Amino acid sequence: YCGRELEQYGQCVAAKPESWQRDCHYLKMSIAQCTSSHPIIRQIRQACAQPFEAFEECLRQNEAAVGNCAEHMRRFLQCAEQV
């Protein structure tokens, strides 16, 4: 979970208990992208670079057998486990 996520979640609940629906639609989704896809930044991509190579190499060589490996959620988890 992200530093821009917990602050804005905090404001939408602190205003009113149902303002977690009412105070933020677009911002509730853009903070959800940070915990759904993570940032595209070079600083993260350098540390999980071996996963980031291997999960592209699944769809490079074996795109027809993605039940054996899939990218975006597996590649992300190996980043959050290191950085």
Side-chain angles (χ1 to χ4, degrees):
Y1 309 101
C2 300
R4 85 294 284 265
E5 187 187 351
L6 274 293
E7 183 178 85
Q8 194 60 247
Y9 166 75
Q11 283 309 293
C12 299
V13 177
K16 296 191 264 75
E18 202 179 42
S19 273
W20 182 217
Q21 199 276 343
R22 202 56 164 185
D23 265 52
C24 52
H25 285 234
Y26 305 86
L27 273 61
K28 183 176 183 175
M29 188 160 169
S30 70
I31 72 184
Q33 305 293 3
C34 194
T35 200
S36 304
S37 309
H38 237 41
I40 65 170
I41 67 180
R42 70 166 61 189
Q43 287 79 0
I44 297 175
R45 290 164 62 167
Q46 211 283 340
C48 54
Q50 296 184 104
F52 202 94
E53 185 187 284
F55 282 119
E56 169 179 67
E57 282 185 344
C58 288
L59 282 70
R60 196 181 181 177
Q61 303 303 125
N62 308 117
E63 74 194 64
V66 166
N68 208 340
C69 48
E71 47 76 81
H72 206 343
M73 298 182 294
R74 304 262 54 73
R75 198 178 52 211
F76 169 33
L77 183 146
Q78 296 291 341
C79 302
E81 199 61 47
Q82 180 70 349
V83 274

